[PDB]
């Protein structure tokens, strides 16, 4: 149907917008602390603490599979990256502090993304 194609075009475009957001958010992590899953080889007990791990590579995988249906689902995953890190790591660590900075600097990007999604539809 022509309708299904139109939906696919929108989802493709949402994916295009979300890819730009993802790139902008990952740019705020030059230390690449959040680039990859927390290694279960280095942190064997990680899953005893964190029940839903997340990272930018995992987000990117879901993104290119067009697995984000709206901005809210994308934001939930971003929030997981930050919130997991701020629970697993203590307040006076490079890890916790990086998450705080990512959350603060990411808010600006996400603020405009929300306006743009509504605006463009
Ligand atoms: C977002 N990253 C993290 O939360 C952590 C990474 C590592 C690496 C070695 C030991 N502990 C940790 S905790």
UniProtKB/Swiss-Prot annotation:
Domain Bromo: 9-113
Annotated compartments: Nucleus; Chromosome
Cross-link Glycyl lysine isopeptide (Lys-Gly) (interchain with G-Cter in SUMO2), sequence positions: 41
Free-text tissue specificity from the UniProt record: Highly expressed in testis.
Oligomer and partners: Component of some HBO1 complex composed of KAT7/HBO1, MEAF6, ING4 and BRD1/BRPF2. Component of the MOZ/MORF complex composed at least of ING5, KAT6A, KAT6B, MEAF6 and one of BRPF1, BRD1/BRPF2 and BRPF3. Interacts (via PHD-type zinc finger domain) with unmodified histone H3. Interacts (via PWWP domain) with dimethylated and trimethylated 'Lys-79' on histone H3.
Role played: Scaffold subunit of various histone acetyltransferase (HAT) complexes, such as the MOZ/MORF and HBO1 complexes, that acts as a regulator of hematopoiesis. Plays a key role in HBO1 complex by directing KAT7/HBO1 specificity towards histone H3 'Lys-14' acetylation (H3K14ac), thereby promoting erythroid differentiation.
Name of the protein in question: Bromodomain-containing protein 1
GN (gene name): BRD1
Residues of the full protein shown: 555 to 674 of 1058
């Amino acid at each position: 149907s022509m309708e299904q194609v139109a939906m696919e075009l929108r989802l493709t475009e949402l994916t295009r917008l979300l890819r730009s957001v993802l790139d902008q958010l990952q740019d705020k992590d030059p230390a690449r602390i959040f680039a990859q899953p927390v290694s279960l080889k280095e942190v064997p007990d990680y899953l005893d603490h964190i029940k839903h791990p997340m990272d930018f590579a995992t987000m990117r995988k879901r993104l290119e599979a067009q697995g984000y249906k709206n901005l809210h689902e994308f934001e939930e995953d971003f929030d997981l990256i930050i919130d997991n890190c701020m629970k697993y790591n203590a307040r006076d660590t490079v890890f916790y502090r990086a998450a705080v900075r990512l959350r603060d600097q990411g808010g600006v990007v996400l603020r405009q993304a929300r306006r743009e999604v509504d605006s463009i539809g």
